[PDB]
């Protein structure tokens, strides 16, 4: 059967999943069929709005045509509002195998069960503490700077060269 064949992959482009940060979801479609697919629709309802917050990207989209021996990509950004294990289920893609042919229902890959970490572990590990250090130096200025001048001002009064 030389009809259209669409292989889909739903994968995460984040090395870790951390609360409050941006999470990446990439849908990759590969048309390994000989004939170009027509009216490709992908729907992703597996993410409720309560857990993941959409930053940019449309979960549900449609494509007019996909050439054979070609591939298409699609990325959406989500923000996990909570911490806890989540089962990243599969998406659903519907397309026409042949011009005026039956609609073919297909499922995209499933990342599986993935754990989401807590924020306080990350900031202590990879967030730069620029401002904290700058305040620390000022915080230690009164303890060091003033005594040094107090010493030095005394030296300025008795260090008369011979």
């Amino acid at each position: 059967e030389e009809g259209a064949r669409l292989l889909a992959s739903k994968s995460l482009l984040n090395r870790y999943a951390v609360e409050g940060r941006d999470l990446t979801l990439q849908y990759n479609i590969y048309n390994v069929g000989s004939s170009a697919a027509l009216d490709v629709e992908l729907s992703d309802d597996s993410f409720p709005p309560e857990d993941f917050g959409i930053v940019s990207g449309m979960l549900n989209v449609k494509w007019d045509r996909i050439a054979p021996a070609s591939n298409v990509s699609h990325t959406v950004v989500l923000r996990p509002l909570k911490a806890g294990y989540f089962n990243f289920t599969s998406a659903t893609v519907t397309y026409l195998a042949q011009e005026d042919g039956p609609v073919v229902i297909g499922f995209t890959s499933a990342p599986g069960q993935g754990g989401i970490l807590a924020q306080r572990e990350f900031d202590r590990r990879f967030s730069p503490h620029f401002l904290d250090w700058a305040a620390f130096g000022v915080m230690t200025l009164p303890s060091i700077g003033i005594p040094l001048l107090l010493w030095y001002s005394s030296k300025r009064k008795y260090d008369t060269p011979k």
Partner: protein
């Protein structure tokens, strides 16, 4: 039906945290409005010569295209995403295949994605900076202390 005087309201996203993200992903979303009320208009996006078919959302008039790139190549700067309709998009493949200039074909509209660069960890760790500045301070005092005690 070719869109007459397409008005667009572009919005773009870009990856700014490499430590969590494996790559730098760019997403351009356009809610295109047409004078002729042309709904469901096929669109394509061209990035530095690479062709990406623009995605169409379920809501009428919303468009999205997302192309990923590796961290080591996602250099800070500006990105210009060009778009071409089905009629022009056919010409573009011919021009590219015939090696004719790609700029000769005017694009329907352009979207610029301003990438400020992703974070590859601090150049010199602040702790190392903190240690040296204090260590330099100690040596000067140590230089001072020895002067008195000598």
């Amino acid at each position: 039906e070719a869109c007459v005087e397409p008005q667009i309201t572009p919005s773009y996203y870009t990856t700014s945290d490499a430590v969590i993200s494996t790559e730098t992903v760019f997403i351009v979303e356009i809610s295109l409005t047409c004078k002729n009320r042309v709904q469901n208009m096929a669109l394509y996006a061209d990035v530095s010569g690479k062709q990406f078919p623009v995605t169409r959302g379920q809501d009428v008039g919303r468009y999205q295209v997302s192309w990923s790139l590796d961290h080591k190549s996602a250099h800070a700067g500006t990105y210009e995403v060009r778009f071409f309709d089905e009629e022009s998009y056919s010409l573009l493949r011919k021009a590219q295949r015939n090696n004719e200039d790609i700029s000769i074909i005017p694009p329907l509209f352009t979207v610029s994605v301003d990438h400020r660069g992703t974070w590859n960890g601090p150049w010199v760790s602040t702790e190392v900076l903190a240690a040296a500045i204090g260590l330099v301070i100690y040596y000067l005092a140590f230089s001072a202390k020895s002067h008195i005690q000598a």
